[PDB]
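Page header: ASSEMBLY MODEL / two components / 97 residues total.
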Amino acid sequence: WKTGPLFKRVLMSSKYADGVTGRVEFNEDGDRKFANYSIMNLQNRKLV
Amino acid sequence: TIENSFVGWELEEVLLLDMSLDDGDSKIQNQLKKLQSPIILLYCTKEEA
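Prediction written out in full:
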């Protein structure tokens, strides 16, 4: 179906920000951009 | 292969066109303006050729 790729152009150019997670945008490969990682440490088998 | 050969093979003006966005612009034509040499290599598919 001809308009296959055309449907992805809006997907790759989508910059929807006001979301439940907030600021989700696909990169060139489509992976998630601008995530958050919480650095975690072990303290006597207990985690902080 | 070019480096380990006594024949003086040389390469220049290596081109790369982006057929991903398909904006329809002349980025292909603008890039190919700076071209010379009588031998040009192509590597594409029949439908897009």
